From Swiss-Prot, chains A, B:
Top-level taxon in the UniProt lineage: Eukaryota
Catalytic activity: [thioredoxin]-dithiol + NADP(+) = [thioredoxin]-disulfide + NADPH + H(+)
Keyword Acetylation: no
GO molecular function term, any single one: thioredoxin-disulfide reductase (NADPH) activity
Alphabetized NCBIfam families for the sequence: TGR
Annotated organism of origin: Mus musculus (Mouse)
Family: Belongs to the class-I pyridine nucleotide-disulfide oxidoreductase family.
Matches recorded under Pfam families: Pyr_redox_2, Pyr_redox_dim
Annotated InterPro entries: FAD/NAD-bd_sf, FAD/NAD-binding_dom, FAD/NAD-linked_Rdtase_dimer_sf, GSHR/TRXR-like, Pyr_nuc-diS_OxRdtase, Pyr_nucl-diS_OxRdtase_dimer, Pyr_OxRdtase_I_AS, Thioredoxin/glutathione_Rdtase
Keywords: Disulfide bond, FAD, Flavoprotein, Mitochondrion, NADP, Oxidoreductase, Redox-active center, Selenocysteine, Transit peptide
Native organism taxonomy: Eukaryota, Metazoa, Chordata, Craniata, Vertebrata
Name listed for the protein in its UniProt record: Thioredoxin reductase 2, mitochondrial
Misc note: The active site is a redox-active disulfide bond. The selenocysteine residue is also essential for catalytic activity.
GN (gene name): Txnrd2
BP terms from Gene Ontology: cell redox homeostasis; heart development; hemopoiesis; response to oxygen radical
Length: 484, 484
């Protein structure tokens, strides 16, 4: 029937807007539909975050870490008997049983909040209504004065790469597999690829990443590079500069993937058990008949063109998350953007969503955290003549007793050359990056100066303290590695 | 012979001033003497920090943590065979071999820096000179135009408690023991006590803490309490409200410690293998003949009375660290205070040492981090009518798959009730507190407002992000535990 607020996408962003909009006392209702993955994989309410990303990854990334924890453990006097095995079955179960705890968890929060849920592959019929396909097939007359679109996106697939859909697997699958990936190839060079490639290796699987160009394109290339080098230096096979052209399933069912070594040879063939495409995601806008509702869109990325109020072309219709063009594809921003929107509508709020200096963390074997600008983006904006950079190479105290190599533990603080020297970008690469970066992202929102950093005392002995020690400049070109 | 800068105490603070003062091109020289512990324990150059504290603790605290890492490990699919043992011998060696790496490490940095080292139990003879006892006995004529005193302190002992010096042990020993503490009693209720009590328990030792009054007196009592409760809830035997009166070594050499249960009974006796006095430290000023040099002092705490330039009564003589009265007994402050001092003297610097809002972290089983004010200190200064407090109870994503209880994971952000609402105290109690707190201590130096926190986006999924989510006020008295 009719509601004064319809939300499309029971996701991290959508749900936020939904629950917060209901808490404002409004008749909220959301429709979410988990259209299966090409390999036939489905999950519960809670968008990408809960089910195929944020939560599972971290959790598997965790299990990987634990592995090194055991190795290290021996040095600290723990007579653990090695080499300790690890089965994909036990882990996956554990993880999944938790995803579900957030499945039948959002569902609970939606009931106690005067909000109705309609599991239906929504689609636009006009200005204020949507049609609802079903696992069965009964459509449903749904209308609301305000419609928020939070449909996120889905794992993009290769084009001419024959043998793709056929045998490829996506981030949407790796998490719910019933049986170990065994051997695997990760065709990607950024966030997903690397992170997945990471724990896979951490588990003990013969993992191999296939970068066509540069790593984490966009990020502070220095840090980006330091990241991969850590992986390669720690068990992750790397095929720098190669692209897929054909995958052929053979008798034993193993995959015979053939590529091109643009770096050296001109074609090479290897075979692996699984193949993971980490080549970006794509908005699920097509499947909405947006055009037949009045919602203008974007050409390149099919995202929903947007306002600054998260509004679209239809002032009573909005978009949030991976869906809205121009916005950072994260979860916090998805969520926050939801609350605020739901408050500006029925809360008398005017504060908009601030998308600047949002921090982030690449949960790779060695976590890479950052906020603000990267050295490049920095000269790009103020010029190399007006930028100062302080960096350091530290050694976690914990990395010492355990003979864990730390030549990858780097830190880079980009700020302006002219006093007080407003810091405008921090880069941390070591253990628990997010845990460290978070605090500092506050210094940015505040415009903390390099002074206030030399004025900030340290919490010894920690890894984050290294940030607040930074003094060696690149101008000075002094040796970065830290003494004392 | 003569030098233009003499430093007393080859410690975290002293050495800093020393090396930095030499880097300014001055003829620096330092004299450090590790007068053994009552139980005959000695170590190398590097003050308390390196040898009996900062570094070792953390390292042993680490080994403890690793233990829970293995337990947890099982849930993430790591078929580790339990229960895994752990021997005090292997750990201690490892740790110590590292302490030494910082022993013959500062020593190296002192050579390459044009600085002479004179291992001599220094003592004041007058204005510009000191005498130097030796492991042998040859005094040494040492003079300098500027003398920095960084003698730190030493573990205080009980008074009338007979059987103390006799069998007691201090933080200075627990680290260098050759054989496992076995069973142990920790007479203390703050930093040292709890931290030591912590890993001891984490190792598997039958550890027991004996608090005479309240925990971490000074700290935000709420947090302080939450801390102990975690310990007690996780293996640490606790004797709330008891005091030592007699320890009697018996045949098997076990210690028969008799106390008084001021909470209930009026005397009780138990026996343990080791007894650790964590009842504060004391300045080693006495042994300097300070008075016979012109350095006025303090009555209660025998610390060296000080300036704001770290200067004493003798304008060419200064004091730093655990030695100088009024200053926070940490290491970073010790170190920073050293550099600055050495720059104001021979660097043309005027910036003084800022001792406000120095962050800190109690490395207990559950790390308690904080900066700024504690709720109490806060009402105390602005009044309960002008203070706002936001708190939360979170659950580390990592604590979920592993069935690790998190009813102790709390967070408290104290700021003013009136917008923008300058945050003036943060409290984090969970994993890697320092790693999390550090960043935020920058927000304080900057005066970040509760707004800039609601404006700061989060790094999901992390523990620190919870801070930047905080919204439930105590004014409102809403249920703290977090949903979604
Ligand atoms: C492997 C991986 C790891 C990640 N890790 C992190 C991390 O650590 N931190 C972080 O901040 N971000 C992370 N992200 C990204 C983050 O999860 C997304 O940015 C966020 O989920 C986007 O939120 P959303 O609400 O816009 O959409 P989504 O969460 O994608 O939800 C959209 C929902 O709507 C449904 N839907 C789509 N079309 C329709 C329709 N027509 N009718 C009905 N329902 C429909 C979908 O099936 C889905 O359930 C990760 C992503 C991946 C892939
Ligand atoms: C168990 C424990 C754990 C700790 N953990 C931390 C932590 O995690 N973080 C933190 O910030 N702080 C920590 N601290 C406190 C920190 O170590 C001290 O605040 C800091 O070491 C003080 O520095 P200092 O230079 O003043 O003196 P010290 O480091 O104590 O050095 C003084 C040196 O001078 C020598 N000396 C004394 N008198 C004479 C004399 N007359 N002649 C010659 N030499 C002399 C001493 O024997 C010693 O070597 C810890 C302390 C303990 C006990
Ligand atoms: N906060 C976090 O921790 C995480 C956030 N996310 C979010 O989800 C998004 C999706 O992740 P992801 O898909 O990995 O990254 P996008 O950043 O989505 O994808 C970029 C990667 O895909 C590669 N790629 C694109 N096309 C091809 C192709 N045809 N063959 C091979 N490689 C190709 C890129 O190469 P090139 O650069 O050479 O074009 C690059 O390595 C992220 O951008 C981020 O917004 C995901 C994981 C974690
Ligand atoms: N940054 C960090 O992580 C660390 C810093 N440190 C520093 O070193 C200092 C020394 O630590 P610590 O000695 O533990 O603490 P102080 O804070 O030095 O000592 C306070 C503790 O000793 C107890 N105590 C004092 N006298 C007695 C007695 N007669 N019987 C029983 N208990 C007694 C106190 O009880 P009550 O309060 O009831 O008087 C309290 O529990 C710290 O204060 C801190 O500056 C030490 C460890 C870690």
């Amino acid at each position: 029937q009719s509601f004064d607020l319809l939300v499309i996408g029971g996701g991290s962003g959508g749900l936020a807007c939904a629950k917060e909009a209901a808490q404002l006392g409004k008749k909220v209702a959301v429709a979410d539909y988990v259209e299966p993955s090409p390999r036939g994989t489905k999950w519960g309410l809670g968008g990408t975050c809960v089910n195929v990303g944020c939560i599972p990854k971290k959790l598997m990334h965790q299990a990987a870490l634990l592995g090194g924890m055991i190795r290290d453990a021996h040095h600290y006097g723990w007579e653990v008997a090695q080499p300790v095995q690890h089965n994909w079955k036990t882990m996956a179960e554990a993880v999944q049983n938790h995803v579900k705890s957030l499945n039948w968890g959002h569902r609970v929060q939606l009931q106690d909040r005067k909000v109705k849920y309609f599991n239906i592959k929504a689609s636009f019929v006009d200005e204020h209504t949507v049609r609802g396909v079903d696992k069965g097939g009964k459509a449903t007359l749904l209308s609301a004065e305000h419609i928020v679109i939070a449909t996120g996106g889905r794992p993009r697939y290769p084009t001419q790469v024959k043998g793709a859909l056929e045998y490829g697997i996506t981030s949407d699958d790796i998490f719910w597999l019933k049986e170990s990936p065994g051997k695997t190839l990760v065709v990607g060079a950024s966030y997903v690829a690397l992170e997945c490639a990471g724990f896979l290796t951490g588990i003990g699987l013969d993992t191999t990443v296939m970068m066509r160009s540069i790593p984490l394109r966009g990020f502070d290339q220095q840090m980006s590079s330091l990241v991969t080098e850590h992986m390669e230096s720690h068990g992750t096979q790397f095929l720098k500069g190669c692209v897929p052209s054909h995958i052929k399933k053979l008798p034993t069912n193993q995959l015979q993937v053939t590529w091109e070594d643009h770096a050296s040879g001109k074609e090479d063939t290897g075979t692996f058990d699984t193949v993971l495409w980490a080549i970006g995601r794509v908005p699920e806008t097509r499947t909405l008949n947006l055009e037949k509702a009045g919602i203008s869109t974007n050409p390149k990325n099919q995202k929903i063109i947007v306002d600054a109020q998260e509004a679209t072309s239809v002032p009573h219709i909005y978009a949030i998350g991976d869906v809205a063009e121009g916005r950072p594809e994260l979860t916090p921003t998805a969520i926050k953007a939801g609350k605020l929107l739901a408050q500006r509508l029925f809360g008398k709020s005017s504060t908009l969503m601030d998308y600047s200096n949002v921090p982030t963390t690449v949960f790779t074997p060695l976590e890479y955290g950052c906020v603000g600008l990267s050295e490049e983006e920095a000269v790009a904006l103020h010029g190399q003549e007006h930028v100062e950079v302080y960096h350091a190479y530290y050694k976690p105290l914990e990395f010492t007793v355990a003979d864990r190599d730390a030549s990858q533990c780097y830190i880079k603080m980009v700020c302006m050359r002219e006093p007080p020297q407003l810091v405008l970008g921090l880069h941390f690469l070591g253990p628990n990056a997010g845990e460290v970066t978070q605090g500092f992202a506050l210094g940015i929102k505040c415009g903390a100066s390099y002074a206030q950093v030399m004025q900030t005392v340290g919490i010894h002995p920690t890894c984050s303290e290294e940030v607040v020690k930074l003094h060696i400049s690149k101008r000075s070109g002094l040796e970065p590695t830290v003494t004392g």
